[PDB]
Write a protein that binds this ligand. Structure first.
Ligand SMILES: COc1cc2c(cc1OC)[C@H](CCc1c[nH]c3ccccc13)N(C=O)CC2
Ligand SMILES: COc1cc2c(cc1OC)[C@H](CCc1c[nH]c3ccccc13)N(C=O)CC2
Ligand SMILES: [Mg+2]
Ligand SMILES: [Mg+2]
Ligand SMILES: [Zn+2]
Ligand SMILES: [Zn+2]
Lengths: 318, 323
């Protein structure tokens, strides 16, 4: 039953696809609602639960059901992954309840209205989105704008009972977190994380200034965004299938328009498995090794699964 | 009359061009006629194969999208920044330094750098939960908008003045223009000025004695600060020009403050027509913003800008003498 699967809401590797099916393609709504109850967020911020559900449904509706990866299931997955990373013991008592709400809300909206093509595609096709956003974090700026504008629909302002200062602080943190999910910022984000681990102070990690605390929240949601290869293989393999479909559909549009095919987007010359191994070796493992170092060692189980999954994918390559 | 306008446009290479008289003589088209004059002067139509009717059509559409009912951030301000940037480009310290494409980018960025400005600040737009601030996530809200509108108008009928640039030329120009206009966000001024000071302290010059700028970062930084200086050049102009710009920015500030007061908001600095000192605010503006910026630019191009800096210091003393 849907209720039984949700008991694992606090566990890495929740059966996200089964929850999507058992909720009638509403995992973002049911999982966000469950997170808000587990962290006592409706009462702490006086969010009418009907307003929460109405916003959540409207937000889920603006994820595209015909986009194979960047849809409402991905959003639900990043939300729940973030939720688990927030309860890392080494980050215990680090973030305020407003910051926790910030990270979770940001996770929920961080890909809304994604068209299934990359920023570079939007720039190179002279899209309306790239013209609006001057080629800079084109998607991420749009995800934020849509995620905030939907708060203005009827009975959707889940922040109505926040103070004016709380709303302003929340809005800034959400913007800083979602802008950091732009993959063109990964290396800089990683470097900041590495610097934090070399200068790491511990009693449990002590982060005194907002600059360091938002840095952790950015890398956290970024880690959640790039957490597919750290999940149990059966979940990882479905995410791989979905991202390859989206990449191949983008490559068909690049091909039909006569554009240079983006990396991993040519269905006629792609090694799905080799790309996964390179994705892990160059992006996901460096990131999660640093995150694990930061919270040494509450992430060892995550790092272990990632390395198991990398081993398995390598073994599929003759 | 076109004869009188033609005479006034003979000053287009001069600091302190009568830009308000050109606005009146051109039938409120200072941006169109000054851009057209400058493109003719720099041979840009021939260099970039820009059809004259396309240039005029774009310019008129662009000028149309400045607000005629905003006292400062209007098409006269845009024409002024264009013309000032045009003079700064000709400074001896930069002779043969920038390519035709970079000159085109700086001048085009100046022309569009405030288009569709509503006459209120970024902070006002953020604080009132404006659609603009919601679109741009509170980050360089106006400046992102000026760019988006300025580029979008190139798509209107017979408006693509870059139709004959190669694809890489358009790509390069687009990025430079974005880099330059985003740097006109006043919240970037301190970091921009800090970088300019570092460049001055580490400046290299070539055999001919011009600035050596051998990488994108340095070249774009000079163009960013050039256009920023032009944008903040009002107090460096002959006093009769400067005082008109002061009258206009203050009217715009006071109208914002009226909206803030009516909304029960705290009034922004310099926006309260009942607790304002025009003269002290100009002196603080020069002392904390304009003179540190222009003194640094003058150091970068020394001694090319000494007369402009002298005028700025004279005008500062004049305003101070009225307190
Ligand atoms: C499950 O597998 C994937 C998941 C995701 C991606 C790629 C996957 O598998 C190859 C790409 C990575 C984009 C990317 C940017 N720089 C890179 C450098 C190397 C590799 C990829 C990238 N995403 C796009 O939104 C995030 C989700
Ligand atoms: C001719 O006079 C003016 C012209 C301009 C301004 C102010 C003027 O006069 C006080 C303001 C400056 C805003 C500003 C940002 N930080 C500051 C610190 C101190 C003072 C002002 C500012 N502008 C607004 O678009 C640019 C043009
Ligand atoms: Mg994204
Ligand atoms: Mg401006
Ligand atoms: Zn994502
Ligand atoms: Zn301006």
């Amino acid at each position: 039953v849907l209720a039984k699967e949700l008991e694992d809401v606090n566990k890495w590797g929740l059966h996200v696809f089964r929850i999507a099916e058992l909720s009638g393609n509403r995992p973002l709504t049911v999982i966000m609602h469950t997170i808000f109850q587990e962290r006592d967020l409706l009462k702490t911020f006086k969010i009418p639960v009907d307003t929460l559900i109405t916003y959540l449904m409207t937000l889920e509706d603006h994820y595209h059901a015909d986009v194979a990866y960047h849809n409402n299931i991905h959003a639900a997955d990043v939300v729940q992954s973030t939720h688990v990373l927030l309860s890392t013991p080494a980050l215990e008592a680090v973030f305020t309840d407003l910051e926790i709400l910030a990270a979770i809300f940001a996770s929920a909206i961080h890909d809304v209205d994604h068209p299934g093509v990359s920023n570079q595609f939007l720039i190179n096709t002279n899209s309306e989105l790239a013209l609006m956003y001057n080629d800079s974090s084109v998607l991420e700026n749009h995800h934020l704008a849509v995620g905030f504008k939907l708060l203005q629909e009827e009975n959707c302002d889940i922040f109505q009972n926040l103070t004016k200062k709380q709303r302003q602080s929340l809005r800034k943190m959400v913007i800083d977190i979602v802008l950091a999910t732009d993959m063109s910022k990964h290396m800089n984000l990683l470097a900041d994380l590495k610097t934090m681990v070399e200068t790491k102070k511990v009693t449990v990690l002590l982060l005194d200034n907002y600059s360091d605390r938002i840095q952790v929240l950015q890398n956290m949601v970024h880690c959640a965004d790039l957490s597919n290869p750290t999940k149990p293989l059966q979940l990882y393999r479905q995410w791989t299938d979905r991202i390859m479909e989206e990449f191949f559909r983008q490559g068909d549009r690049e091909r039909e328009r006569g554009m240079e095919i983006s990396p991993m987007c040519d269905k006629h010359n792609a090694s799905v498995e080799k790309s996964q191994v390179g994705f892990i070796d160059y992006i996901v493992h460096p990131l999660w090794e640093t995150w694990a170092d930061l919270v040494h060692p509450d992430a060892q189980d995550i790092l272990d699964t990632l390395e198991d999954n990398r081993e398995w994918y390598q073994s599929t390559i003759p």
